[PDB]
Amino acid sequence: FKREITNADGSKDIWYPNGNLKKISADGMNLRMLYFNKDIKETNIREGTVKYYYAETNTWHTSYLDGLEILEFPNGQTEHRRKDGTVEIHFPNNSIKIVDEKLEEWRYADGTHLVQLRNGDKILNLPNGQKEIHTK
């Protein structure tokens, strides 16, 4: 039932009875499970990454050894997530940073720097050299 085939190079093709196909490189540093449900799972040993692909939401999920976790959406929005709670989100073409003073923090393509604090105040640094402070 569970069919595992080892090719001449050393690579492996394994067929599961459920419908899932799994592939292993000749050096065994790259593993790929083709779940049916149309999901894809990729493991890169040399890069220490594990990628989960959801075909139901078209979302890629990459996890790193240091704790870095990246989510990729079809809209173009990318979300970085460190273990220390710090979160970065990438829009076209903006970027919001979150650390747990500053509630949020935004950097734009203009070079514009927006800082939002917990009190509600806002600091806006414009690329033309202007500084902008918003108060209650």
Tab-separated table of N, CA and C in Angstrom:
chain	number	residue	atom	x	y	z
A	1	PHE	N	0.825	-1.201	0.000
A	1	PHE	CA	0.000	0.000	0.000
A	1	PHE	C	0.863	1.256	0.000
A	2	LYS	N	1.570	1.483	1.102
A	2	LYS	CA	2.502	2.599	1.188
A	2	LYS	C	3.716	2.326	0.308
A	3	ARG	N	3.762	2.968	-0.853
A	3	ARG	CA	4.834	2.727	-1.812
A	3	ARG	C	5.944	3.770	-1.739
A	4	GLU	N	7.140	3.324	-1.370
A	4	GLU	CA	8.311	4.191	-1.345
A	4	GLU	C	9.324	3.750	-2.395
A	5	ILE	N	9.660	4.655	-3.307
A	5	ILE	CA	10.610	4.345	-4.369
A	5	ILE	C	11.891	5.161	-4.240
A	6	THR	N	13.018	4.466	-4.133
A	6	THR	CA	14.319	5.122	-4.078
A	6	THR	C	14.990	5.076	-5.445
A	7	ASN	N	15.126	6.238	-6.073
A	7	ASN	CA	15.717	6.324	-7.402
A	7	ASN	C	17.220	6.064	-7.386
A	8	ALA	N	17.830	6.077	-8.567
A	8	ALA	CA	19.251	5.772	-8.701
A	8	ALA	C	20.141	6.849	-8.085
A	9	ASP	N	19.689	8.098	-8.144
A	9	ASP	CA	20.466	9.214	-7.612
A	9	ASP	C	20.472	9.233	-6.085
A	10	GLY	N	19.423	8.679	-5.488
A	10	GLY	CA	19.291	8.658	-4.045
A	10	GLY	C	18.023	9.355	-3.597
A	11	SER	N	17.402	10.085	-4.518
A	11	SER	CA	16.153	10.778	-4.232
A	11	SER	C	15.026	9.779	-3.994
A	12	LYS	N	13.978	10.220	-3.309
A	12	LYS	CA	12.880	9.327	-2.964
A	12	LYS	C	11.516	9.862	-3.384
A	13	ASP	N	10.722	8.987	-3.994
A	13	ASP	CA	9.334	9.285	-4.310
A	13	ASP	C	8.446	8.305	-3.560
A	14	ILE	N	7.605	8.825	-2.673
A	14	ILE	CA	6.757	7.971	-1.848
A	14	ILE	C	5.269	8.274	-2.037
A	15	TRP	N	4.514	7.239	-2.395
A	15	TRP	CA	3.074	7.352	-2.593
A	15	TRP	C	2.309	6.836	-1.380
A	16	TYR	N	1.435	7.674	-0.832
A	16	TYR	CA	0.583	7.267	0.278
A	16	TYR	C	-0.792	6.851	-0.235
A	17	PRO	N	-1.431	5.884	0.444
A	17	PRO	CA	-2.753	5.398	0.028
A	17	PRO	C	-3.840	6.466	0.139
A	18	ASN	N	-3.611	7.487	0.957
A	18	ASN	CA	-4.583	8.565	1.114
A	18	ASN	C	-4.613	9.505	-0.090
A	19	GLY	N	-3.521	9.522	-0.846
A	19	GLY	CA	-3.424	10.353	-2.032
A	19	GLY	C	-2.263	11.325	-1.976
A	20	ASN	N	-1.625	11.413	-0.815
A	20	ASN	CA	-0.505	12.330	-0.630
A	20	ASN	C	0.788	11.812	-1.249
A	21	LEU	N	1.451	12.666	-2.022
A	21	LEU	CA	2.752	12.334	-2.587
A	21	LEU	C	3.847	13.081	-1.837
A	22	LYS	N	4.916	12.372	-1.493
A	22	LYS	CA	6.028	12.977	-0.775
A	22	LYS	C	7.321	12.802	-1.560
A	23	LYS	N	8.132	13.852	-1.607
A	23	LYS	CA	9.386	13.809	-2.349
A	23	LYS	C	10.572	14.185	-1.468
A	24	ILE	N	11.650	13.417	-1.580
A	24	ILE	CA	12.876	13.692	-0.844
A	24	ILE	C	14.050	13.791	-1.811
A	25	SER	N	14.843	14.849	-1.672
A	25	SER	CA	16.007	15.051	-2.526
A	25	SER	C	17.055	13.964	-2.302
A	26	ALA	N	18.002	13.861	-3.229
A	26	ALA	CA	19.043	12.838	-3.156
A	26	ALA	C	19.928	13.000	-1.922
A	27	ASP	N	20.113	14.243	-1.487
A	27	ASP	CA	20.932	14.524	-0.313
A	27	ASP	C	20.090	14.531	0.958
A	28	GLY	N	18.772	14.496	0.787
A	28	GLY	CA	17.853	14.458	1.908
A	28	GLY	C	17.745	15.779	2.646
A	29	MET	N	18.187	16.855	2.002
A	29	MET	CA	18.143	18.180	2.608
A	29	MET	C	16.863	18.924	2.239
A	30	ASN	N	16.139	18.397	1.257
A	30	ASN	CA	14.890	19.006	0.818
A	30	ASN	C	13.743	18.004	0.768
A	31	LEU	N	12.702	18.268	1.550
A	31	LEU	CA	11.545	17.385	1.615
A	31	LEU	C	10.281	18.133	1.206
A	32	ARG	N	9.433	17.478	0.420
A	32	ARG	CA	8.196	18.099	-0.036
A	32	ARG	C	7.026	17.121	-0.018
A	33	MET	N	6.037	17.406	0.823
A	33	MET	CA	4.830	16.592	0.888
A	33	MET	C	3.684	17.261	0.142
A	34	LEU	N	3.232	16.626	-0.932
A	34	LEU	CA	2.110	17.139	-1.703
A	34	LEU	C	0.803	16.562	-1.177
A	35	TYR	N	0.298	17.139	-0.089
A	35	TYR	CA	-0.983	16.727	0.477
A	35	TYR	C	-2.064	16.857	-0.582
A	36	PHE	N	-3.016	15.932	-0.604
A	36	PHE	CA	-4.208	16.187	-1.404
A	36	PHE	C	-5.390	16.634	-0.557
A	37	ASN	N	-5.933	17.770	-0.989
A	37	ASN	CA	-6.485	18.840	-0.169
A	37	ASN	C	-5.737	20.004	-0.790
A	38	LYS	N	-4.839	19.609	-1.691
A	38	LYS	CA	-4.000	20.488	-2.497
A	38	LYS	C	-2.987	21.307	-1.707
A	39	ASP	N	-2.751	20.919	-0.459
A	39	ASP	CA	-1.771	21.604	0.375
A	39	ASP	C	-0.344	21.165	0.056
A	40	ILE	N	0.603	22.081	0.229
A	40	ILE	CA	2.014	21.785	0.001
A	40	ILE	C	2.821	22.039	1.270
A	41	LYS	N	3.701	21.102	1.609
A	41	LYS	CA	4.594	21.268	2.750
A	41	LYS	C	6.043	21.108	2.312
A	42	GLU	N	6.858	22.119	2.592
A	42	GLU	CA	8.260	22.097	2.196
A	42	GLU	C	9.192	22.240	3.394
A	43	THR	N	10.210	21.387	3.444
A	43	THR	CA	11.208	21.451	4.502
A	43	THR	C	12.609	21.610	3.926
A	44	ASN	N	13.254	22.722	4.256
A	44	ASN	CA	14.628	22.959	3.839
A	44	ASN	C	15.567	22.858	5.035
A	45	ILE	N	16.306	21.756	5.108
A	45	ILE	CA	17.203	21.504	6.230
A	45	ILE	C	18.362	22.494	6.266
A	46	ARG	N	18.945	22.757	5.101
A	46	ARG	CA	20.102	23.639	5.002
A	46	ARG	C	19.757	25.088	5.329
A	47	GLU	N	18.478	25.431	5.229
A	47	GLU	CA	18.029	26.784	5.537
A	47	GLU	C	17.185	26.822	6.808
A	48	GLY	N	16.908	25.645	7.362
A	48	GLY	CA	16.161	25.533	8.602
A	48	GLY	C	14.758	26.102	8.523
A	49	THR	N	14.110	25.921	7.377
A	49	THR	CA	12.774	26.464	7.171
A	49	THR	C	11.741	25.382	6.889
A	50	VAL	N	10.518	25.613	7.355
A	50	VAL	CA	9.401	24.725	7.063
A	50	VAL	C	8.238	25.539	6.509
A	51	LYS	N	7.889	25.294	5.252
A	51	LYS	CA	6.835	26.056	4.592
A	51	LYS	C	5.522	25.285	4.486
A	52	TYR	N	4.454	25.871	5.020
A	52	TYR	CA	3.119	25.297	4.901
A	52	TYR	C	2.315	26.115	3.900
A	53	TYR	N	1.846	25.469	2.838
A	53	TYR	CA	1.019	26.141	1.838
A	53	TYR	C	-0.441	25.696	1.910
A	54	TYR	N	-1.339	26.661	2.088
A	54	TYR	CA	-2.771	26.392	2.149
A	54	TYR	C	-3.404	26.716	0.810
A	55	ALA	N	-4.005	25.714	0.179
A	55	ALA	CA	-4.641	25.910	-1.116
A	55	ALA	C	-6.104	26.312	-0.963
A	56	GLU	N	-6.541	26.465	0.282
A	56	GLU	CA	-7.912	26.852	0.581
A	56	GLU	C	-8.000	28.356	0.798
A	57	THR	N	-6.862	28.962	1.126
A	57	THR	CA	-6.786	30.399	1.353
A	57	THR	C	-5.684	31.029	0.504
A	58	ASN	N	-4.996	30.197	-0.276
A	58	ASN	CA	-3.849	30.624	-1.077
A	58	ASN	C	-2.806	31.353	-0.233
A	59	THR	N	-2.515	30.797	0.939
A	59	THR	CA	-1.599	31.423	1.883
A	59	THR	C	-0.354	30.576	2.126
A	60	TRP	N	0.811	31.200	1.994
A	60	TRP	CA	2.076	30.541	2.300
A	60	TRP	C	2.533	30.888	3.713
A	61	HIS	N	2.981	29.878	4.452
A	61	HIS	CA	3.426	30.072	5.827
A	61	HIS	C	4.820	29.490	6.044
A	62	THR	N	5.806	30.368	6.193
A	62	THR	CA	7.186	29.941	6.389
A	62	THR	C	7.626	30.137	7.838
A	63	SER	N	8.217	29.098	8.421
A	63	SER	CA	8.717	29.168	9.790
A	63	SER	C	10.228	28.976	9.827
A	64	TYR	N	10.902	29.762	10.661
A	64	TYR	CA	12.357	29.709	10.757
A	64	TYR	C	12.817	29.123	12.089
A	65	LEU	N	14.102	28.792	12.171
A	65	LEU	CA	14.674	28.212	13.382
A	65	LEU	C	14.777	29.225	14.517
A	66	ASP	N	15.097	30.470	14.178
A	66	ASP	CA	15.227	31.519	15.185
A	66	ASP	C	13.874	31.906	15.776
A	67	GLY	N	12.804	31.545	15.075
A	67	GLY	CA	11.460	31.833	15.535
A	67	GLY	C	10.688	32.711	14.573
A	68	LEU	N	11.376	33.206	13.548
A	68	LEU	CA	10.748	34.055	12.542
A	68	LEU	C	9.663	33.301	11.781
A	69	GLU	N	8.465	33.874	11.749
A	69	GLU	CA	7.354	33.277	11.019
A	69	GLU	C	6.758	34.271	10.030
A	70	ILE	N	6.700	33.873	8.763
A	70	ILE	CA	6.250	34.759	7.698
A	70	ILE	C	4.995	34.231	7.010
A	71	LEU	N	3.984	35.087	6.894
A	71	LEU	CA	2.749	34.731	6.203
A	71	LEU	C	2.614	35.522	4.906
A	72	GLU	N	2.334	34.822	3.812
A	72	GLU	CA	2.203	35.462	2.508
A	72	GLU	C	0.794	35.306	1.943
A	73	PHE	N	0.171	36.433	1.615
A	73	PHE	CA	-1.193	36.442	1.094
A	73	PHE	C	-1.215	36.769	-0.399
A	74	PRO	N	-2.259	36.308	-1.111
A	74	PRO	CA	-2.372	36.562	-2.552
A	74	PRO	C	-2.561	38.041	-2.884
A	75	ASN	N	-3.057	38.821	-1.929
A	75	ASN	CA	-3.250	40.252	-2.141
A	75	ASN	C	-1.928	41.010	-2.246
A	76	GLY	N	-0.875	40.426	-1.683
A	76	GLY	CA	0.444	41.029	-1.708
A	76	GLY	C	0.941	41.392	-0.323
A	77	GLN	N	0.081	41.205	0.672
A	77	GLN	CA	0.415	41.545	2.049
A	77	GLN	C	1.249	40.455	2.718
A	78	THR	N	2.401	40.849	3.251
A	78	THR	CA	3.307	39.923	3.919
A	78	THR	C	3.443	40.286	5.393
A	79	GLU	N	3.352	39.289	6.267
A	79	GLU	CA	3.413	39.537	7.705
A	79	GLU	C	4.566	38.803	8.385
A	80	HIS	N	5.543	39.566	8.865
A	80	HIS	CA	6.669	39.005	9.605
A	80	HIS	C	6.343	38.938	11.093
A	81	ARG	N	6.758	37.854	11.740
A	81	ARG	CA	6.463	37.652	13.154
A	81	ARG	C	7.628	37.022	13.912
A	82	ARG	N	8.334	37.838	14.689
A	82	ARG	CA	9.410	37.340	15.538
A	82	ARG	C	8.845	36.748	16.824
A	83	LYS	N	9.684	36.024	17.557
A	83	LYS	CA	9.258	35.382	18.796
A	83	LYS	C	9.144	36.380	19.944
A	84	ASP	N	9.832	37.510	19.820
A	84	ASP	CA	9.832	38.523	20.874
A	84	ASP	C	8.573	39.390	20.865
A	85	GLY	N	7.616	39.034	20.015
A	85	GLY	CA	6.354	39.747	19.946
A	85	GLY	C	6.313	40.795	18.851
A	86	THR	N	7.486	41.184	18.359
A	86	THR	CA	7.576	42.195	17.312
A	86	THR	C	6.981	41.694	15.999
A	87	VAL	N	6.072	42.482	15.433
A	87	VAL	CA	5.376	42.100	14.209
A	87	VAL	C	5.553	43.148	13.115
A	88	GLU	N	5.913	42.693	11.918
A	88	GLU	CA	6.017	43.576	10.763
A	88	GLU	C	5.087	43.121	9.645
A	89	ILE	N	4.344	44.065	9.079
A	89	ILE	CA	3.442	43.768	7.974
A	89	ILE	C	3.821	44.586	6.746
A	90	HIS	N	3.926	43.921	5.600
A	90	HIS	CA	4.323	44.590	4.366
A	90	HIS	C	3.163	44.736	3.388
A	91	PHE	N	2.789	45.981	3.112
A	91	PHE	CA	1.769	46.283	2.119
A	91	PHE	C	2.463	46.763	0.854
A	92	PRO	N	1.700	46.941	-0.238
A	92	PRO	CA	2.218	47.685	-1.389
A	92	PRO	C	1.840	49.164	-1.291
A	93	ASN	N	2.784	50.026	-0.921
A	93	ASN	CA	4.150	49.618	-0.611
A	93	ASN	C	4.547	50.047	0.802
A	94	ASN	N	3.576	50.026	1.710
A	94	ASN	CA	3.785	50.483	3.080
A	94	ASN	C	4.420	49.420	3.973
A	95	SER	N	4.571	49.748	5.253
A	95	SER	CA	5.122	48.822	6.237
A	95	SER	C	4.824	49.291	7.660
A	96	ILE	N	4.178	48.435	8.447
A	96	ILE	CA	3.853	48.762	9.833
A	96	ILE	C	4.627	47.894	10.827
A	97	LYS	N	5.256	48.544	11.802
A	97	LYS	CA	6.038	47.853	12.819
A	97	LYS	C	5.356	47.953	14.179
A	98	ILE	N	5.361	46.855	14.929
A	98	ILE	CA	4.725	46.822	16.243
A	98	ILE	C	5.624	46.191	17.303
A	99	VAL	N	5.931	46.957	18.346
A	99	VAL	CA	6.718	46.452	19.466
A	99	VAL	C	5.917	46.586	20.756
A	100	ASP	N	6.024	45.588	21.629
A	100	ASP	CA	5.295	45.602	22.891
A	100	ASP	C	6.235	45.791	24.077
A	101	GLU	N	4.999	52.922	25.047
A	101	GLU	CA	5.090	54.149	24.262
A	101	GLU	C	4.381	54.019	22.918
A	102	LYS	N	5.093	53.480	21.933
A	102	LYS	CA	4.590	53.402	20.567
A	102	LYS	C	3.573	52.281	20.380
A	103	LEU	N	2.338	52.658	20.066
A	103	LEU	CA	1.302	51.690	19.734
A	103	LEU	C	1.637	51.029	18.405
A	104	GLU	N	1.769	51.848	17.369
A	104	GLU	CA	2.150	51.371	16.046
A	104	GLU	C	3.271	52.235	15.484
A	105	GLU	N	3.722	51.900	14.280
A	105	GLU	CA	4.770	52.660	13.609
A	105	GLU	C	4.780	52.325	12.122
A	106	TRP	N	4.721	53.353	11.281
A	106	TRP	CA	4.599	53.152	9.841
A	106	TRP	C	5.714	53.833	9.055
A	107	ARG	N	6.205	53.147	8.027
A	107	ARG	CA	7.171	53.727	7.102
A	107	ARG	C	6.673	53.548	5.673
A	108	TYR	N	6.746	54.613	4.882
A	108	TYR	CA	6.163	54.610	3.544
A	108	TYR	C	7.218	54.686	2.444
A	109	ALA	N	6.759	54.655	1.196
A	109	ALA	CA	7.649	54.702	0.042
A	109	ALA	C	8.254	56.090	-0.142
A	110	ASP	N	7.571	57.105	0.381
A	110	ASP	CA	8.067	58.475	0.328
A	110	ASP	C	9.281	58.632	1.232
A	111	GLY	N	9.396	57.738	2.208
A	111	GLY	CA	10.388	57.871	3.256
A	111	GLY	C	9.710	58.442	4.484
A	112	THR	N	8.404	58.661	4.359
A	112	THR	CA	7.593	59.213	5.436
A	112	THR	C	7.551	58.272	6.634
A	113	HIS	N	7.792	58.821	7.819
A	113	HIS	CA	7.788	58.031	9.043
A	113	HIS	C	6.656	58.463	9.968
A	114	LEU	N	5.704	57.564	10.191
A	114	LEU	CA	4.588	57.836	11.089
A	114	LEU	C	4.717	57.041	12.383
A	115	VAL	N	4.640	57.741	13.508
A	115	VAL	CA	4.722	57.100	14.813
A	115	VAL	C	3.446	57.331	15.613
A	116	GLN	N	2.758	56.245	15.949
A	116	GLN	CA	1.546	56.333	16.755
A	116	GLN	C	1.791	55.800	18.161
A	117	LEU	N	1.532	56.641	19.156
A	117	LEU	CA	1.797	56.287	20.546
A	117	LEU	C	0.528	55.835	21.262
A	118	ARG	N	0.698	55.253	22.445
A	118	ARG	CA	-0.422	54.697	23.201
A	118	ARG	C	-1.425	55.750	23.671
A	119	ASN	N	-0.937	56.954	23.952
A	119	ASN	CA	-1.803	58.033	24.420
A	119	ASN	C	-2.765	58.535	23.347
A	120	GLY	N	-2.359	58.409	22.088
A	120	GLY	CA	-3.175	58.853	20.974
A	120	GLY	C	-2.450	59.866	20.112
A	121	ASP	N	-1.343	60.389	20.628
A	121	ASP	CA	-0.536	61.358	19.898
A	121	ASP	C	0.098	60.738	18.660
A	122	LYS	N	0.434	61.583	17.691
A	122	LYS	CA	1.027	61.122	16.442
A	122	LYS	C	2.223	61.979	16.049
A	123	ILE	N	3.294	61.325	15.616
A	123	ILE	CA	4.456	62.023	15.086
A	123	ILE	C	4.638	61.654	13.621
A	124	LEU	N	4.658	62.664	12.757
A	124	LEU	CA	4.728	62.431	11.322
A	124	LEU	C	5.941	63.115	10.702
A	125	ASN	N	6.919	62.314	10.292
A	125	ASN	CA	8.117	62.839	9.651
A	125	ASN	C	8.027	62.758	8.132
A	126	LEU	N	7.972	63.919	7.489
A	126	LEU	CA	7.842	63.992	6.038
A	126	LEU	C	9.216	64.039	5.370
A	127	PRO	N	9.317	63.500	4.143
A	127	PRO	CA	10.600	63.431	3.433
A	127	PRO	C	11.169	64.800	3.058
A	128	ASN	N	10.332	65.833	3.053
A	128	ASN	CA	10.790	67.171	2.691
A	128	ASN	C	11.470	67.895	3.850
A	129	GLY	N	11.614	67.201	4.974
A	129	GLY	CA	12.288	67.759	6.132
A	129	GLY	C	11.340	68.251	7.209
A	130	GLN	N	10.044	68.224	6.918
A	130	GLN	CA	9.043	68.690	7.872
A	130	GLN	C	8.785	67.675	8.979
A	131	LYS	N	8.460	68.182	10.164
A	131	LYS	CA	8.112	67.347	11.306
A	131	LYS	C	6.709	67.721	11.769
A	132	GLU	N	5.882	66.716	12.035
A	132	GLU	CA	4.478	66.957	12.341
A	132	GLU	C	4.054	66.246	13.622
A	133	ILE	N	3.553	67.016	14.584
A	133	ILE	CA	3.128	66.466	15.868
A	133	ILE	C	1.635	66.670	16.102
A	134	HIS	N	0.928	65.576	16.368
A	134	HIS	CA	-0.509	65.633	16.615
A	134	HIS	C	-0.811	65.372	18.087
A	135	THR	N	-1.646	66.221	18.676
A	135	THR	CA	-1.963	66.118	20.096
A	135	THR	C	-3.474	66.021	20.311
A	136	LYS	N	-3.862	65.520	21.483
A	136	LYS	CA	-5.256	65.344	21.895
A	136	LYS	C	-6.194	66.460	21.440
